[PDB]
Paper text:
[name] is a regulator of transcription elongation known to interact directly with Pol II, thereby playing important roles in suppressing genome instability. In this study, we solved several cryo-EM structures of Pol II ECs complexed with [name] in different nucleotide-binding states of the helicase. The [name] [name] module, encompassing the αN helix and KIX domain, wraps around the surface of the RPB1 lower jaw with exquisite molecular complementarity, serving as an anchor point of [name] on Pol II. Meanwhile, the helicase domain binds to the RPB1 upper jaw and downstream DNA.
Purified and mildly crosslinked EC bound to [name] (catalytically inactive D157A mutant and without addition of ATP, ECREC-Apo) was deposited on graphene oxide grids and subjected to cryo-EM imaging. We focused first on the [name] module interactions. To improve the resolution in this region, we reprocessed this dataset, classifying in the [name] module region instead of the helicase domain. This approach greatly improved the map’s local resolution at the [name]–Pol II interface, enabling us to trace the polypeptide chain. Several residues in α3 (N595, K598, and R610) participate in hydrogen bonding or ionic interactions with residues in RPB1. Additionally, residues in the top half of α3 (V593, L596, L602) and in α1 (K548, H552) mediate nonpolar interactions with RPB1. R544, which is situated in a loop between α1 and α2, forms salt bridges with D1241 and D1242 in RPB1. Our structure further shows that the αN helix binds to a shallow nonpolar groove in the top face of the RPB1 lower jaw. Several residues (W504, Y508, M512, and R515) stick into this groove to interact with RPB1, while two others (F507 and Q511) interact with residues in the wall of the groove.
Author numbering:
A (entry chain U): 498 to 620
B (entry chain A): 1162 to 1305
Write the structure that this text describes.
Amino acid sequence: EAHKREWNLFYQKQMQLRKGKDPKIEEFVPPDENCPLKEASSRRIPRLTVKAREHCLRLLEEALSSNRQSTRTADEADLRAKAVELEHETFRNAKVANLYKASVLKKVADIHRASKDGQPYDM
Amino acid sequence: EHTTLRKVTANTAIYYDPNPQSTVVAEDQEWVNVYYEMPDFDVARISPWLLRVELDRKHMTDRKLTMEQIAEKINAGFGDDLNCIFNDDNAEKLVLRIRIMNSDENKMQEEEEVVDKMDDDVFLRCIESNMLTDMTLQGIEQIS
């Protein structure tokens, strides 16, 4: 109990020395003109820039395209909407940036596994 | 039943990794690149020293623990200023790479700040000891 509090204060003071002077740099960037991301302008996930969210959506898009060429469904028009839906589901289910990214790559890996097995990625 | 990180850790090492795209450990280079290519992630402030934790799969599965849960507990206990990255659950081994995210951006000749800074090697060792002893991944303390 006392050791836990001592460690907490000690760790906070140690990691404050690595912040030091000018601890401002927030500079949140609002989304660009044509961000294809549901709930683009949000701050639910700290330290998650909009560009990283777009990057994760883009990775989901390549995963969906690979699944398409490995399944041969109707067309790729719905791929973009499906990728946005999956990205929004990942964003909702995640709370911080790194675990959100990990969930994104887990979804990509699941899509790749479905493509290897030959089955389309269901909702 | 109390379960700290030690009960689910196969091993733990501290490396000097100045360049995450270099990744002196060869096995992780496949899945570390997909983490440092994100626009929000920059190698400018990542700290060179890296704490690599290899998790025992049998002990992890006996408790139905996921690397997602371990990372969530790390974020809760140590804040969002300690970078944590982990592999895929289907990989051959469970790897957890942790770095001390130094939020300073200037770093211009410092300000003679070497008084109690504790260069990240020994600080990472202390963080590792705290993570292995007082992390409470699962269960209630005083129950074994």
